[PDB]
Structure 1
Amino acid sequence: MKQYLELMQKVLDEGTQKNDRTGTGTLSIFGHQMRFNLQDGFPLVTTKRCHLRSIIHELLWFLQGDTNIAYLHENNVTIWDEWADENGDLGPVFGKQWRAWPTPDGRHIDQITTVLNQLKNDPDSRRIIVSAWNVGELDKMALAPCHAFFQFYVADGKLSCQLYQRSCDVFLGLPFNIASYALLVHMMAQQCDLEVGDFVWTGGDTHLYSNHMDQTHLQLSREPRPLPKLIIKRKPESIFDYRFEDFEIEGYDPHPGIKAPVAI
């Protein structure tokens, strides 16, 4: 997509060499923002084939409040295998914080239900927020949440959402993150009877790994195709009752997929 390749090129032109946790090395910039008007089409990258099955099931998994990879395996999704322990557990990552953030006084707060209540009863609120960044449980998480914090906003009958992502693998992770949150905005808007507005992505350490350079040069030689359209076929009773089969991505005609290793 145009915004996405512009970011790739910016990182190549302006990124500084940085060592990283994984020992791979990156080119890195700090602080970037882009905006996707969801009415223009579903922001799924077309200059390489993205695996929609993994994208959709990962989100349905977050929404169940699940942090064990068994559900993903049952559905032949293997994107989280490297970080799971021997029991398939990741610790209280995304889904657990979204659905059941534990309090000091022994309560569990379901942030997704709170948001739905705010959207339905106080849409002008400037506090419609979900955070995965639970300081008190970081030490138990397999990986600290990279997409850490997001905010909804309603104006003129449209639902917008901004994500803060502290750390972004531009080549592997970012195409998934964009499509994942665009999907959630479409689901939330359907449930609240709103139109889709903008998805605003904000990055902290936004980087290309040093062993993704050939792949990046390949992809940058490709022309983007027209964006596909997202069709939701059914309106479930709640945000927690969506199924893989409810989504149809129409007119997705990507360039070939590009293999790249993940930095563990």
Structure 2
Amino acid sequence: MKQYLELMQKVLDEGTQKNDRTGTGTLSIFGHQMRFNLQDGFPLVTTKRCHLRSIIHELLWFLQGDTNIAYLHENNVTIWDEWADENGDLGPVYGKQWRAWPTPDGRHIDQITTVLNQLKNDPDSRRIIVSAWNVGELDKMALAPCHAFFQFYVADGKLSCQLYQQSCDVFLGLPFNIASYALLVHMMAQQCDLEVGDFVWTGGDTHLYSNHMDQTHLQLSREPRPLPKLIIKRKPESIFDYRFEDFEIEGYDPHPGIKAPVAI
């Protein structure tokens, strides 16, 4: 999108060369922010074809509080394969923290449920937050959450959401996350009878991997196309009852997909 392409160019122009845990190398900048007015259309990138299938099942997978990739396989999404253990477990990542954050005294907190109730009973709240950054359980995760802190905000019937992404793979992960959260916002707005507002993206260590230069240059020379339109076919009785079939994207005409190796 114009904002996304602009960020890519910034990394290439101002990025600092860094050696990462994978040994591949990265171009990096620290601190950036983009805003997507959801009224203008769904923020699914068009300068490269994105697969909405894996994006939607992952989100539904999170909402169920599931951390085993079994469900993702049932739907042919393999984005989490290389971090799962021999049994397909990732540890207490996203899904677990969102649905049942463990307290030191044994109880459990369902942040999604509390968020739903805050939006309905106390929309003006300044602490409508979901955090996946559970310090005392990080060592148990097969990987540290790269998008671990987000906040909802309501003003004039509109529902907005800001996501702080501490670590960000610009080429592979970013397009995925923008679409994923814009999706959650639409879902939330529907369950709470609100209009969709803005999706604010805030980055920390925002990088571009060394073996992605070519693909980035290719994508940068393409012209962005009008954003698609998200359509929700039916309104389920809760935020936990959605299915892949309920979503329909419309008017999505992207440039051809771009293959790129993942840094493991």
With structure 2 as the length reference, what TM-score do the two structures score?
Answer: 1.00
Instruction: Please report how far the alpha carbon of residue 246 of structure 1 lies from its aligned counterpart in structure 2 after TM superposition.
Output: 0.2
Q: Which residue of 2 aligns with 1:155?
A: 155
CA distance in 2, matches of 1:152, 1:21: 33
Query: Could you say what secondary structure the match of 1:147 adopts?
Result: coil
- What secondary structure does 1:117 align onto? helix
For residues 23 and 240 of structure 2, the distance between their equivalents in structure 1, rounded to whole angstroms, comes to: 39
Task: Check if 1:178 corresponds to 2:181.
Answer: no
Deviation at 1:22, TM superposition (A): 1.2
Shift of 1:50: 0.3
CA root-mean-square deviation: 0.4
Residue 28 of structure 1: CA displacement? 0.2
Alignment deviations for residues 136-183 of structure 1 (CA, whole Å, 9 cap, x no partner): 100000110110100000000000000010000000000000000000
Quote the residue 1:108 is aligned against. 108
Following the alignment from structure 1 to structure 2, what is the Cα–Cα distance between the partners of residues 68 and 35? Answer: 32
Using the alignment, how far apart are the partners of 1:241 and 1:222 within structure 2? 38
1:180-231: per-residue Cα shift (whole Å, max 9, x none)? 0000000000000000000000000000000000000000000001100000
Report the secondary structure of 1:59's partner residue.
helix
Residues of 2 paired with 1:245 and 1:166: CA distance?
32
Shift, 1:33, TM fit: 0.3
Q: Quote how far apart the aligned CAs of 1:79 are.
A: 0.2
Distance 1:139 1:23 in 2: 22
Q: 5+ unaligned residues in a row in structure 1: which ranges?
A: none
Q: For the residues of structure 1 that align with 2:53 and 2:116, how far apart are their CA atoms? A: 26
Q: C-alpha distance in 2, partners of 1:64/1:151?
A: 20
Look up the match of 1:76.
Answer: 76
Cα distance, 1:21 vs structure 2: 1.3
2:148 match: secondary structure: strand
1:8-47 equivalence runs, <5 A: 8-47=8-47
Q: How many residues align?
A: 264
Distance in 1 separating the partners of 2:198 and 2:91: 32
Distance in 2 (CA, whole Å) between partners of 1:89 and 1:219 is 34
Q: Secondary structure at the match of 1:201?
A: strand
Q: State the distance in 2 between where 1:21 and 1:148 align.
A: 20
Q: Distance in 1 between matches of 2:38 and 2:173?
A: 20
Q: Give 1:208's aligned residue.
A: 208
CA deviations on 1:38-94 (whole Å, 9 max, x unpaired) are 000000000000011000000000000000000000000000001000000000000
1:11-40 Cα shifts (integer Å, max 9, x gaps): 000001011111110000000000000000
Q: Structure 2: how far apart are the matches of 1:228 and 1:217?
A: 24
How many Å separate the matches in 1 of 2:126 and 2:21? Answer: 35
1: distance between equivalents of 2:142 and 2:106? 23
The residue number in structure 2 matching 1:128 is: 128
- Runs of 5+ consecutive residues of structure 2 not aligned to the other structure: none
State the distance in 2 between where 1:210 and 1:80 align.
22
Identity %: 99
